[PDB]
């Protein structure tokens, strides 16, 4: 019957939408890898920033290492 053949033909009309859905799925699986690599980027580039920005970005936890040299002069 024409009706059934029409339904079967039309079953795949929306190919592009299904492909967009596929884009969404694979990117959802992939994108969390940005966190490891982001941490490492920041790890490497932290000692390049100004001392003030190092102190700020760590909420004051980070401070200049104390190795027993270059102390104040009376």
């Amino acid at each position: 019957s024409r009706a059934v053949y029409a339904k079967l033909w039309a079953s795949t009309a929306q190919y592009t939408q299904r492909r967009h859905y596929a884009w969404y799925q694979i990117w959802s699986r992939v994108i969390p890898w940005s966190v490891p690599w982001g941490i490492f980027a920041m790890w490497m580039v932290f000692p390049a920033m100004p001392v003030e920005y190092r102190q700020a970005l760590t909420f004051g936890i980070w401070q200049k290492p104390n190795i027993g040299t270059h102390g104040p002069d009376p």
């Binding site: 029409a6 033909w9 039309a10 009309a13």
Partner: protein, 49 residues
């Protein structure tokens, strides 16, 4: 059958470029900005339902 019943243009004599048979297809087909080539045949844009 037709190959042994038709005439052919290459079986007959011509001497000047102005006597060559003229193409059946029209020169006026493809249009648009910066399109050098004005004539094409085939494309793969998809068919509807």
């Amino acid at each position: 059958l037709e190959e042994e019943q038709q005439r052919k243009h290459l079986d007959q004599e011509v001497t000047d470029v102005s006597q060559l048979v003229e193409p059946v297809s029209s020169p006026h087909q493809t249009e648009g900005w910066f399109k050098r080539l004005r004539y094409w045949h085939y494309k793969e844009t998809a068919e509807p339902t």
